Amino acid sequence: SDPSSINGGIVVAMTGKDCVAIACDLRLGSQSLGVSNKFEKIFHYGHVFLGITGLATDVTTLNEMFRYKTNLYKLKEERAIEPETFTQLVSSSLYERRFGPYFVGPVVAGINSKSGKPFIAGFDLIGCIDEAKDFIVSGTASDQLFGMCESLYEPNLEPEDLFETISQALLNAADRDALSGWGAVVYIIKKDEVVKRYLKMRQD
Amino acid sequence: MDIILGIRVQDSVILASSKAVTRGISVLKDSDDKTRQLSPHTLMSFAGEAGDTVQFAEYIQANIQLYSIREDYELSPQAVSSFVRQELAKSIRSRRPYQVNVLIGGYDKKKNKPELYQIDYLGTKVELPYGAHGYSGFYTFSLLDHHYRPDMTTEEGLDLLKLCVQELEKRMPMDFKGVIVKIVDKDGIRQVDDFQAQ
Amino acid sequence: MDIILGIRVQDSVILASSKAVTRGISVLKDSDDKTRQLSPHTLMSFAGEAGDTVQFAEYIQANIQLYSIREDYELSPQAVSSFVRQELAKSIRSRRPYQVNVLIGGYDKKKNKPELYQIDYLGTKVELPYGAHGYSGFYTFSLLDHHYRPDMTTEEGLDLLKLCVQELEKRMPMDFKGVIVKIVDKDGIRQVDDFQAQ
Amino acid sequence: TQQPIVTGTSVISMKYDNGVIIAADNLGSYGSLLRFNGVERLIPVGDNTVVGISGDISDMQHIERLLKDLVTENAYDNPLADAEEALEPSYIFEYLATVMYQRRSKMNPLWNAIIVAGVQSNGDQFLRYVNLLGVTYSSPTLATGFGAHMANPLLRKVVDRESDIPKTTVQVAEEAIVNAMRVLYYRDARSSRNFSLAIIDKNTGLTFKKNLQVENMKWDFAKDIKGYGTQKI
Amino acid sequence: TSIMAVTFKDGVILGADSRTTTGAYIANRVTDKLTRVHDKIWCCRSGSAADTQAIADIVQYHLELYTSQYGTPSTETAASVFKELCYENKDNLTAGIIVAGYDDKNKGEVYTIPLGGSVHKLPYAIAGSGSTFIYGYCDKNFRENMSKEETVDFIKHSLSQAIKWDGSSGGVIRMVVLTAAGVERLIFYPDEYEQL
Amino acid sequence: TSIMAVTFKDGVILGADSRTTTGAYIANRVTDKLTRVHDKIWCCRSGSAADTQAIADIVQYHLELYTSQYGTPSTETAASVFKELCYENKDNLTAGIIVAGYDDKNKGEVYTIPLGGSVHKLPYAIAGSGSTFIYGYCDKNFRENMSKEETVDFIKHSLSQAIKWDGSSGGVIRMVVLTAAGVERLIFYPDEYEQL
Amino acid sequence: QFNPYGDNGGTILGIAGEDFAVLAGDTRNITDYSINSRYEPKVFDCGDNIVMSANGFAADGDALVKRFKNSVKWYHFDHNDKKLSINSAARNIQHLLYGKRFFPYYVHTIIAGLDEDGKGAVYSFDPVGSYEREQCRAGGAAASLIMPFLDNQVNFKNQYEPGTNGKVKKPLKYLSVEEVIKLVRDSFTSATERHIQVGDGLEILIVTKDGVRKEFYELKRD
Amino acid sequence: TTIVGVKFNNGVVIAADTRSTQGPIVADKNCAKLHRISPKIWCAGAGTAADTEAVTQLIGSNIELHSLYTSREPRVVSALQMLKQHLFKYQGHIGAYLIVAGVDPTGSHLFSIHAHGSTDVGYYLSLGSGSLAAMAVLESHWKQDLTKEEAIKLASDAIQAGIWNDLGSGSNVDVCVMEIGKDAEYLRNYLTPNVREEKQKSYKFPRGTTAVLKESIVNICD
Amino acid sequence: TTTLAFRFQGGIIVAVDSRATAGNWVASQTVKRVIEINPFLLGTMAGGAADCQFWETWLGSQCRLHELREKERISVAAASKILSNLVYQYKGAGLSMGTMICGYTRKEGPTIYYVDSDGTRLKGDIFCVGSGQTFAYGVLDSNYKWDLSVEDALYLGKRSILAAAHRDAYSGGSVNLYHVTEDGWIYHGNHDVGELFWKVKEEEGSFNNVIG
């Protein structure tokens, strides 16, 4: 019954030479019943991306909570928030609710408009932070991802090769996870230009 | 649980909702209307826990109506369902949560497009071409996966929906005492009192 | 639970028994015969736990038939029901008891009188003018208390029994998928395949 | 099912170039109470094996009996009963493990952890665990109770792999095992201060040391600890 | 574990082991279970850890705020501030606590606040999981008013057996003598009490 | 409650109170918790009532059937027949049982069969809810081999405190001396052990 | 309450090649958060060219195997030292396992070898007897980390022929025992990186029409 | 989780591995249990991750506010009084056990607070999954007065005993040395005994393997 | 699990998926959910993986003894009875298994008997057991006709399992088909649900809400 597995889903992020990639499946279902295949888990505030897994009603609320928050930030500092300055936020945020947590597993990922360096980060429900130079995974097929990433990952891939590696990890774990699938979408984030793509996968 | 179906077609939404009401061993009624119109072009069906069910429905209805005379403008399907998911969202983490699942189907006179939102008591919202709450889905979802097309006429949808009910009857243990159908579109809401008068 | 009705009239017994069979969420069948003829003029309906139900019925039937060729004489309704209550009686205090309730309605060619015995899984037997097992009684017993008369024709009984069913439909939550009726008398057993073909 | 009443704690052991070691204090706890001392948990069998037992004492006392009778029995109509055909460690252990399992499989176990150490007739070292569940496994080092948590670590800084036994002097092995026994007594409310260490060298044979104790301790640095943060006196 | 405080000729002496277990593991084997809340007022902690620790912290606080305005406090006083906390909160506290102090007038007295905040003043008291064994000795070998040494070899033999049969208690003995002279610290290593 | 048997010069002496509680009520206040299974072989019951009682009944039986064909049995023997029953049945028995006997050769020995049928031979043993208090005395005041009197004033002072702090144990002391001389019965009333 | 079961971690793996078969399994053996031995085999040759491994609760494993091997022994005794056809073997293992249907062996067992035509062959088992002829099966603690990988690699899943869009699936060719062992090794190292119950060593048994071969490779002792 | 701390002549040193668990799966392969309360005051956190990193956070911030206002360097017992006063208020529902260490204008200090607010002191402490491992490497090789290099060598040789013998701890060692009259030195990775060997195959796919359905360029600003 | 079988002019049509799952992970997508009792009878597999496989294979041996003795083909009814009887003996012990015994003898024509561990033994025309049974029943209920061709009878069974596969998370993999005739059963291959979907969507138009 674990609140973090009613709805299902997965998210994964990777870093490459001057870019990052963030990907997720599309399914939202109740227990075994599949309800939707257009449920996206990746949002963005300015040039900062956040993917969220877990209890759907919380995933939605958090997006709204962060949109709200980031808009107020921009207005006050006269600039969009950065990836690190943002991670710190969603961490404190998650924690202010330490004794009635939102049941999620966020994952930030972006590029710093000043330095120009790639960034990816993960957190657990109460907000513990976690940077990594290679990859972040979260979700129901969490283990299947660690297995794929700890094989297919390669430092400094070119954005065109990163797209292939990340896709393949997502694609294959979602096939060994009974509650993740029904489509996927992947993003390739550079300093400028952001390309979004939907992939073709088994619909079972 | 109760029956709650809904399907969006070419230019309108259709809502099906079983008529029976049961308290334990008996059936106190076989002509209950689980619907409740929020505004001229937004309709919302519901099903859930005994008391929670309509206390909530009316509450929502009251807020929308208030907003509508105040602004003298009509709130849109999209924004209406958004408000609902907000409430239910806060509800789940309160001394005692409403256990209510819903379907909202309105006509966006601004885009001239029908829209149907399905929301469960946890605050989980999603826009769909057709939906259902509770066990209602397992018996129908496959038939609709099969025949549904976005170009369908209101006239065609009903015929479809009829099939789903016929299936619900043949394989469902509970006797839901039939359904009541309602249509939402550019001209407002009307009741197909002829799926019952048939 | 399942539906098991029975009523004795002027010169015969009538047995009603819902047709559906349900395993959890679905209905695997809507044409099941809960009956099982023990001998030319003894009929026995049943309803209870999934497996226990017909393993027992057949067992009983086998004993009676054995006795009948052996003696070449037919055991009487009274003695047949006595045997049943004996078994079920021993059953309740055994590693695992059959959870089966029954109705036995035969024609005593010796007294030229119809007799109906109602027995529950505990070994509780009683001779009645009409009976029912499980929840089936609350919806009917009053109607029969009202109209039943011992002088009734077979023809009148059916009309009565029809009413009870119509009531079972209107107020019972479960959809039992109709009933199958059967008549026992001086000429044996026959099936009123016209309460179904109606 | 059941519950153990009287109980012996750890039993640490290790291998070296010519043989194996195995120690275990002599206390037999009765819960928080330490109602016993003249308790021997090192049961040698024959002239080439020793079995260190842990856990319920009533069940240990039971095995011992079984072992004795296994001996008094191998002789029955066997003239080489002290030479060519005489109980090996591997025979004893195989037999023991059998029983242990057979038992859990009847839901009536013997609450014990066991070590069978010795040297085969052809000279090889033998060290194998076996607890009340039947689970068994070999290794350079072995220990019951805390041994698995506090002994092991140290007895590994010595023989880190199967490629170090050959270069481990019977003397270095012991000097460690005893410092380990110092540690065990340092942090384990269910342990005794004096013990019994037994060696099984392929050349020298079986050496059964008895009643010793742990010397060379450090409690001086206690005088310096005062209070818990604020107290200055 | 094992704690106690004994009254004698000059005033009183309170001592107790160093062992503090968490399961059958020894978290610390050299603990200072003798907290001082004031110059001539000390106490030996028993029961839970974290709780007793914080009580003292508070009890101290008050006294330190007392003298500051009502002059140096008695000993009967301190044992009151102690129960007040141990009573009102008997629901979320597990404290053994023994209080002892030397007052110029009244000589030196001993009060024992057990589970429940039930206060008692006795010649001497003994609490801690290990006290269950030294009920023979302690009682049968106790003469009223001893000497500064005639007694230190009591605390020593009591605390001797306490360690000898109660696993949850051991380490090194620790004494604190509250006298007209003042505070004195003692410590009698293992190879010693076992020797006896 | 409080039972024990001590070995000395001639042979051994086993004694124990009379109190047997059922809740906080005293069902009997003059119980003979010293069962004899044979001439020079006796034992003092502890733990459950009905169980221990029936064990003895049986243990006796065997021995009586032993001598009858294998001559008078040792003492180590009796303590075996005792554990055999206490082991095989550790599931439905609650027995404390202490066994003591005097054999011409081996002098007099003492074995203690505790919960679990774990057998042990010691200089002397002490079992019963009240033993928890006389672990101080008993150990610190024990010299190897005493006299017939030099010891009777031990059992007397042990059993003294046992009663003094353990409610579940009291009544009148009861001793039985197994010697070359034979069996002797003693009984030392309340106004006496309290006196000390 | 006495609980008769325990989990000793471990992971095993069995791939069936075109004309050979492998079955690998790390050597670490654990209990809760501790180590019991960095080298304790869980993969044995049982005779007649059949490798077997039972992973889960250490003891039930040893028992089954011993029980199986003593069974091969008697199959010979009663049918003239006839060879045990690996299929005939799995059927037999079923009965052994189902023998204890109501006090089950708490283990996932796997055999592997050659059929009666010389082709490789693997067999995965339920802990109560349900068996199926698998061609590649990871079972154990980290099976959920190696199956997604082999899926992709050994069976080329989710891979398509470039420049044909989602229209042509990349064709499967069959791996030389050499390549398979490189696959097998990478899988186990990854697993050790992310799973605390996997590490120390990896022992591999290769079945071919000459007998059984064994190879070892050290893993990290995390 | 496997941390220790030991003081010498002119200061104190603490070390901690870098491996966060989460069931048997590894989450962070290079974490950081060492936090800064104030320049010369550091903590080592075992147990519930978020809790320790969030509590040190707090206390730190407040002490910074404290010194500023009082115009004096942060004492170490303050940081202690703060932590255990807070830890207690929450009857242990904020599972953060840790080792606080530092140096103030009154000497060098070392403490260990448990979850419920209990605190103890000594010259060397161990907290975590492998506390019994690194506490056999401390109750053996310990002596009063130890060179800076000795203290450092011991602390890092304790952690190591945790890495290898415990499953709930591994990867690298992290160290921080606080010396009197001197600044503090943070040694992120004073050791790196574990380094995955190189793979056996390159797993990069040829461009166009994955099948796409739609593509497009999303916007950001306004 | 989604298994089904039904009667019609051509005889019987059996269809199953192949997914087996442990908790939320797909331990296998290659399960033979059809037990080939013998050349003339097939049993399906729901409930317990082993209980189904074991006893049904046992049942096959039984039919063989019976046929050697009577020198005649055993009847579907007698076979189904034997099974349920053995099952009933263990009622309580914890077995688990929903199943379809399918045969077509000379005298009784084409017969399907549903049988489960409760001791239930039902005769029928259409049966669906599983976690996807509800979805399979949909496509099936609306399209079944006694006069289905053979070609279409197989396609119906296939599309049915597919429907489940898609919606029920615990169902999927590859569909396996069999057709049972008065001379025995014929295997009709193993079709991967992955590929079949895209095919149907494209050639049937159905599955609109799926972008691809």
PDB file of N, CA, C and O in Angstrom, chain C residues 21 23-29 32 49-56 58 95-98, chain I residues 81 85 88-89 91-92 114 116 118-124 126-128 133-134 137:
ATOM      1  N   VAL C  21     -24.024 -17.118 -10.205  1.00  0.00           N
ATOM      2  CA  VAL C  21     -22.868 -17.672  -9.517  1.00  0.00           C
ATOM      3  C   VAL C  21     -21.769 -16.614  -9.626  1.00  0.00           C
ATOM      4  O   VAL C  21     -21.367 -16.222 -10.718  1.00  0.00           O
ATOM      5  N   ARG C  23     -17.897 -15.137  -8.435  1.00  0.00           N
ATOM      6  CA  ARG C  23     -16.592 -15.307  -7.835  1.00  0.00           C
ATOM      7  C   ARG C  23     -15.908 -13.954  -7.717  1.00  0.00           C
ATOM      8  O   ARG C  23     -15.296 -13.441  -8.661  1.00  0.00           O
ATOM      9  N   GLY C  24     -16.063 -13.373  -6.533  1.00  0.00           N
ATOM     10  CA  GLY C  24     -15.464 -12.093  -6.241  1.00  0.00           C
ATOM     11  C   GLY C  24     -16.081 -10.922  -6.954  1.00  0.00           C
ATOM     12  O   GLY C  24     -17.182 -10.499  -6.638  1.00  0.00           O
ATOM     13  N   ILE C  25     -15.357 -10.407  -7.934  1.00  0.00           N
ATOM     14  CA  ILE C  25     -15.784  -9.239  -8.686  1.00  0.00           C
ATOM     15  C   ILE C  25     -16.726  -9.553  -9.846  1.00  0.00           C
ATOM     16  O   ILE C  25     -17.645  -8.781 -10.124  1.00  0.00           O
ATOM     17  N   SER C  26     -16.521 -10.693 -10.504  1.00  0.00           N
ATOM     18  CA  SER C  26     -17.343 -11.055 -11.653  1.00  0.00           C
ATOM     19  C   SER C  26     -18.421 -12.091 -11.399  1.00  0.00           C
ATOM     20  O   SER C  26     -18.513 -12.679 -10.334  1.00  0.00           O
ATOM     21  N   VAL C  27     -19.234 -12.301 -12.419  1.00  0.00           N
ATOM     22  CA  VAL C  27     -20.326 -13.252 -12.382  1.00  0.00           C
ATOM     23  C   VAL C  27     -20.016 -14.300 -13.460  1.00  0.00           C
ATOM     24  O   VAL C  27     -20.270 -14.071 -14.638  1.00  0.00           O
ATOM     25  N   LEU C  28     -19.462 -15.441 -13.063  1.00  0.00           N
ATOM     26  CA  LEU C  28     -19.112 -16.494 -14.012  1.00  0.00           C
ATOM     27  C   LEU C  28     -20.282 -17.208 -14.644  1.00  0.00           C
ATOM     28  O   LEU C  28     -20.083 -18.014 -15.539  1.00  0.00           O
ATOM     29  N   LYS C  29     -21.495 -16.947 -14.178  1.00  0.00           N
ATOM     30  CA  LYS C  29     -22.646 -17.647 -14.733  1.00  0.00           C
ATOM     31  C   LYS C  29     -23.980 -17.090 -14.236  1.00  0.00           C
ATOM     32  O   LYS C  29     -24.098 -16.674 -13.086  1.00  0.00           O
ATOM     33  N   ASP C  32     -27.392 -21.030 -13.274  1.00  0.00           N
ATOM     34  CA  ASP C  32     -26.996 -22.158 -12.460  1.00  0.00           C
ATOM     35  C   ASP C  32     -28.222 -22.782 -11.797  1.00  0.00           C
ATOM     36  O   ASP C  32     -29.132 -22.083 -11.367  1.00  0.00           O
ATOM     37  N   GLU C  49     -21.516 -22.350   1.150  1.00  0.00           N
ATOM     38  CA  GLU C  49     -20.131 -22.092   0.823  1.00  0.00           C
ATOM     39  C   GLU C  49     -19.717 -22.718  -0.508  1.00  0.00           C
ATOM     40  O   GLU C  49     -20.070 -23.845  -0.818  1.00  0.00           O
ATOM     41  N   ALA C  50     -18.947 -21.957  -1.272  1.00  0.00           N
ATOM     42  CA  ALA C  50     -18.440 -22.343  -2.585  1.00  0.00           C
ATOM     43  C   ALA C  50     -18.234 -23.825  -2.901  1.00  0.00           C
ATOM     44  O   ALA C  50     -18.967 -24.393  -3.714  1.00  0.00           O
ATOM     45  N   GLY C  51     -17.231 -24.454  -2.300  1.00  0.00           N
ATOM     46  CA  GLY C  51     -16.994 -25.857  -2.606  1.00  0.00           C
ATOM     47  C   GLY C  51     -17.946 -26.838  -1.946  1.00  0.00           C
ATOM     48  O   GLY C  51     -18.461 -27.748  -2.600  1.00  0.00           O
ATOM     49  N   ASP C  52     -18.173 -26.626  -0.647  1.00  0.00           N
ATOM     50  CA  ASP C  52     -19.026 -27.459   0.202  1.00  0.00           C
ATOM     51  C   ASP C  52     -20.405 -27.746  -0.358  1.00  0.00           C
ATOM     52  O   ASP C  52     -20.924 -28.845  -0.243  1.00  0.00           O
ATOM     53  N   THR C  53     -20.992 -26.725  -0.950  1.00  0.00           N
ATOM     54  CA  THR C  53     -22.311 -26.786  -1.536  1.00  0.00           C
ATOM     55  C   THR C  53     -22.717 -28.034  -2.338  1.00  0.00           C
ATOM     56  O   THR C  53     -23.593 -28.770  -1.911  1.00  0.00           O
ATOM     57  N   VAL C  54     -22.102 -28.293  -3.487  1.00  0.00           N
ATOM     58  CA  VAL C  54     -22.518 -29.450  -4.286  1.00  0.00           C
ATOM     59  C   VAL C  54     -21.792 -30.755  -4.026  1.00  0.00           C
ATOM     60  O   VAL C  54     -22.193 -31.798  -4.522  1.00  0.00           O
ATOM     61  N   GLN C  55     -20.698 -30.708  -3.293  1.00  0.00           N
ATOM     62  CA  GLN C  55     -20.003 -31.941  -2.984  1.00  0.00           C
ATOM     63  C   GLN C  55     -20.992 -32.714  -2.110  1.00  0.00           C
ATOM     64  O   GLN C  55     -21.219 -33.912  -2.281  1.00  0.00           O
ATOM     65  N   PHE C  56     -21.579 -31.979  -1.170  1.00  0.00           N
ATOM     66  CA  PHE C  56     -22.544 -32.493  -0.212  1.00  0.00           C
ATOM     67  C   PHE C  56     -23.810 -32.959  -0.901  1.00  0.00           C
ATOM     68  O   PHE C  56     -24.246 -34.085  -0.705  1.00  0.00           O
ATOM     69  N   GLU C  58     -24.493 -33.905  -3.970  1.00  0.00           N
ATOM     70  CA  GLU C  58     -24.277 -35.153  -4.688  1.00  0.00           C
ATOM     71  C   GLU C  58     -24.117 -36.337  -3.720  1.00  0.00           C
ATOM     72  O   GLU C  58     -24.700 -37.395  -3.932  1.00  0.00           O
ATOM     73  N   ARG C  95     -13.495 -32.173  11.860  1.00  0.00           N
ATOM     74  CA  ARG C  95     -12.337 -31.340  11.519  1.00  0.00           C
ATOM     75  C   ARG C  95     -12.734 -30.092  10.732  1.00  0.00           C
ATOM     76  O   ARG C  95     -12.269 -28.980  11.013  1.00  0.00           O
ATOM     77  N   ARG C  96     -13.604 -30.279   9.747  1.00  0.00           N
ATOM     78  CA  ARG C  96     -14.071 -29.166   8.933  1.00  0.00           C
ATOM     79  C   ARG C  96     -15.482 -29.473   8.458  1.00  0.00           C
ATOM     80  O   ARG C  96     -15.710 -30.443   7.723  1.00  0.00           O
ATOM     81  N   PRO C  97     -16.449 -28.637   8.871  1.00  0.00           N
ATOM     82  CA  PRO C  97     -17.852 -28.802   8.516  1.00  0.00           C
ATOM     83  C   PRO C  97     -18.272 -28.226   7.179  1.00  0.00           C
ATOM     84  O   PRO C  97     -17.741 -27.213   6.731  1.00  0.00           O
ATOM     85  N   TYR C  98     -19.235 -28.896   6.551  1.00  0.00           N
ATOM     86  CA  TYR C  98     -19.808 -28.437   5.300  1.00  0.00           C
ATOM     87  C   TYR C  98     -20.634 -27.227   5.720  1.00  0.00           C
ATOM     88  O   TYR C  98     -21.333 -27.295   6.724  1.00  0.00           O
TER      89      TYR C  98
ATOM     90  N   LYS I  81     -13.750 -33.681 -12.996  1.00  0.00           N
ATOM     91  CA  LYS I  81     -14.201 -34.140 -11.694  1.00  0.00           C
ATOM     92  C   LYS I  81     -13.003 -34.594 -10.865  1.00  0.00           C
ATOM     93  O   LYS I  81     -12.808 -34.137  -9.746  1.00  0.00           O
ATOM     94  N   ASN I  85     -11.948 -33.038  -7.316  1.00  0.00           N
ATOM     95  CA  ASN I  85     -12.012 -33.917  -6.152  1.00  0.00           C
ATOM     96  C   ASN I  85     -10.707 -33.871  -5.357  1.00  0.00           C
ATOM     97  O   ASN I  85     -10.724 -33.692  -4.142  1.00  0.00           O
ATOM     98  N   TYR I  88     -10.534 -30.611  -3.670  1.00  0.00           N
ATOM     99  CA  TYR I  88     -11.400 -30.515  -2.512  1.00  0.00           C
ATOM    100  C   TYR I  88     -10.817 -31.194  -1.282  1.00  0.00           C
ATOM    101  O   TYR I  88     -11.047 -30.761  -0.158  1.00  0.00           O
ATOM    102  N   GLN I  89     -10.068 -32.267  -1.482  1.00  0.00           N
ATOM    103  CA  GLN I  89      -9.480 -32.952  -0.349  1.00  0.00           C
ATOM    104  C   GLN I  89      -8.584 -32.040   0.457  1.00  0.00           C
ATOM    105  O   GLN I  89      -8.509 -32.179   1.669  1.00  0.00           O
ATOM    106  N   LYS I  91      -8.988 -28.812   0.818  1.00  0.00           N
ATOM    107  CA  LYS I  91      -9.664 -27.561   1.116  1.00  0.00           C
ATOM    108  C   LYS I  91      -9.279 -27.176   2.517  1.00  0.00           C
ATOM    109  O   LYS I  91      -9.435 -27.959   3.443  1.00  0.00           O
ATOM    110  N   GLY I  92      -8.747 -25.972   2.659  1.00  0.00           N
ATOM    111  CA  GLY I  92      -8.318 -25.512   3.958  1.00  0.00           C
ATOM    112  C   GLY I  92      -6.815 -25.365   3.987  1.00  0.00           C
ATOM    113  O   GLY I  92      -6.308 -24.323   4.380  1.00  0.00           O
ATOM    114  N   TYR I 114     -14.801 -24.840 -15.549  1.00  0.00           N
ATOM    115  CA  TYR I 114     -13.999 -23.982 -14.709  1.00  0.00           C
ATOM    116  C   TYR I 114     -13.850 -24.759 -13.418  1.00  0.00           C
ATOM    117  O   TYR I 114     -14.797 -25.379 -12.949  1.00  0.00           O
ATOM    118  N   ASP I 116     -11.731 -24.517  -9.451  1.00  0.00           N
ATOM    119  CA  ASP I 116     -10.814 -23.811  -8.565  1.00  0.00           C
ATOM    120  C   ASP I 116     -10.633 -24.498  -7.221  1.00  0.00           C
ATOM    121  O   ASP I 116     -11.363 -25.431  -6.891  1.00  0.00           O
ATOM    122  N   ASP I 118     -11.420 -23.845  -4.312  1.00  0.00           N
ATOM    123  CA  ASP I 118     -12.549 -23.765  -3.382  1.00  0.00           C
ATOM    124  C   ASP I 118     -13.327 -25.071  -3.472  1.00  0.00           C
ATOM    125  O   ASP I 118     -14.025 -25.457  -2.544  1.00  0.00           O
ATOM    126  N   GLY I 119     -13.211 -25.734  -4.613  1.00  0.00           N
ATOM    127  CA  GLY I 119     -13.919 -26.974  -4.840  1.00  0.00           C
ATOM    128  C   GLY I 119     -14.993 -26.737  -5.878  1.00  0.00           C
ATOM    129  O   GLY I 119     -15.783 -27.625  -6.174  1.00  0.00           O
ATOM    130  N   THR I 120     -15.022 -25.534  -6.440  1.00  0.00           N
ATOM    131  CA  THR I 120     -16.021 -25.193  -7.437  1.00  0.00           C
ATOM    132  C   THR I 120     -15.745 -25.887  -8.724  1.00  0.00           C
ATOM    133  O   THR I 120     -14.602 -25.982  -9.127  1.00  0.00           O
ATOM    134  N   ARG I 121     -16.797 -26.341  -9.385  1.00  0.00           N
ATOM    135  CA  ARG I 121     -16.669 -26.995 -10.679  1.00  0.00           C
ATOM    136  C   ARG I 121     -17.827 -26.526 -11.549  1.00  0.00           C
ATOM    137  O   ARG I 121     -18.947 -26.993 -11.400  1.00  0.00           O
ATOM    138  N   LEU I 122     -17.561 -25.590 -12.452  1.00  0.00           N
ATOM    139  CA  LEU I 122     -18.611 -25.083 -13.308  1.00  0.00           C
ATOM    140  C   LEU I 122     -18.499 -25.431 -14.760  1.00  0.00           C
ATOM    141  O   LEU I 122     -17.406 -25.465 -15.317  1.00  0.00           O
ATOM    142  N   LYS I 123     -19.643 -25.685 -15.381  1.00  0.00           N
ATOM    143  CA  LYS I 123     -19.675 -25.967 -16.804  1.00  0.00           C
ATOM    144  C   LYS I 123     -19.990 -24.607 -17.403  1.00  0.00           C
ATOM    145  O   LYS I 123     -20.693 -23.825 -16.769  1.00  0.00           O
ATOM    146  N   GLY I 124     -19.484 -24.307 -18.601  1.00  0.00           N
ATOM    147  CA  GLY I 124     -19.758 -23.004 -19.201  1.00  0.00           C
ATOM    148  C   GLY I 124     -19.431 -22.814 -20.677  1.00  0.00           C
ATOM    149  O   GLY I 124     -19.045 -23.768 -21.347  1.00  0.00           O
ATOM    150  N   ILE I 126     -18.185 -19.374 -21.715  1.00  0.00           N
ATOM    151  CA  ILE I 126     -17.170 -18.335 -21.692  1.00  0.00           C
ATOM    152  C   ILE I 126     -16.639 -18.188 -20.280  1.00  0.00           C
ATOM    153  O   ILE I 126     -17.399 -18.065 -19.326  1.00  0.00           O
ATOM    154  N   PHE I 127     -15.327 -18.201 -20.145  1.00  0.00           N
ATOM    155  CA  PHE I 127     -14.725 -18.037 -18.842  1.00  0.00           C
ATOM    156  C   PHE I 127     -13.507 -17.148 -18.941  1.00  0.00           C
ATOM    157  O   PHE I 127     -12.795 -17.190 -19.924  1.00  0.00           O
ATOM    158  N   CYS I 128     -13.288 -16.320 -17.930  1.00  0.00           N
ATOM    159  CA  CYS I 128     -12.122 -15.449 -17.873  1.00  0.00           C
ATOM    160  C   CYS I 128     -11.693 -15.401 -16.438  1.00  0.00           C
ATOM    161  O   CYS I 128     -12.479 -15.040 -15.575  1.00  0.00           O
ATOM    162  N   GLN I 133      -9.319 -10.255 -15.904  1.00  0.00           N
ATOM    163  CA  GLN I 133     -10.545 -10.892 -16.342  1.00  0.00           C
ATOM    164  C   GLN I 133     -11.621  -9.888 -16.718  1.00  0.00           C
ATOM    165  O   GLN I 133     -12.302 -10.062 -17.720  1.00  0.00           O
ATOM    166  N   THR I 134     -11.768  -8.827 -15.927  1.00  0.00           N
ATOM    167  CA  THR I 134     -12.797  -7.822 -16.202  1.00  0.00           C
ATOM    168  C   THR I 134     -12.699  -7.165 -17.578  1.00  0.00           C
ATOM    169  O   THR I 134     -13.718  -6.926 -18.227  1.00  0.00           O
ATOM    170  N   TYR I 137     -13.335  -9.791 -20.444  1.00  0.00           N
ATOM    171  CA  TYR I 137     -14.785  -9.956 -20.547  1.00  0.00           C
ATOM    172  C   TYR I 137     -15.472  -8.896 -21.405  1.00  0.00           C
ATOM    173  O   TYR I 137     -16.500  -9.149 -22.026  1.00  0.00           O
TER     174      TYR I 137
END
